[PDB]
Amino acid sequence: SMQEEDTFRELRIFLRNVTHRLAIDKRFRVFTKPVDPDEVPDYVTVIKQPMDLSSVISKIDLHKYLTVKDYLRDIDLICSNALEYNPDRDPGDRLIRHRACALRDTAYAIIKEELDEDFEQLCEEIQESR
């Protein structure tokens, strides 16, 4: 319905705002763009499903997210891909793991503070109806 499309549009506006606040954070620069194969050649080999904040923005605009849970699955994928690719005790790995966990924690905390639980519930019920 037209009312339901307004609901999903509000969700997209919210998700773009959260994603922008993550993308401008200096700690998360490594997560803002796909990994360059010329720079990191073993990445495409270890990580089967890459995800980054620019790809998240594109999926918002393609109406791929109908609930915040769909969005958080891709935030969680950014984080879990980073932990998987950086498992070593080396400081370069430890730094990215710390940033990856901060990205995930920050996104969850913004959503917990700013997304109305009834709004998310409405989104889920519209989605379950289609």
Ligand X SMILES: CC(=O)c1csc(NC(=O)[C@@H]2CNCCN2)n1
**Interacting residues with ligand X (CB under 6 A):** 30, 35, 40, 82, 85-86, 88, 90, 92-93, 96
- Please say whether the beta carbons of 51 and 77 come within 8 A: yes
As measured in angstroms, the least distance from the Cβ of 68 to ligand X is 23
67: left (phi over 0), alpha (psi -120 to 50) or beta: beta
As measured in angstroms, the least distance from the Cβ of 21 to ligand X is 19
Residue reference for tokens 């994603």: 19
Residue 79 vs 122, nearer CB to ligand X = 79
Residue number with the smallest Cβ distance to ligand X: 92
What are the residues whose beta carbons fall under 8 Å from the beta carbon of 116, sequence distance 6 or more?
Answer: none
As measured in angstroms, the least distance from the Cβ of 34 to ligand X is 9
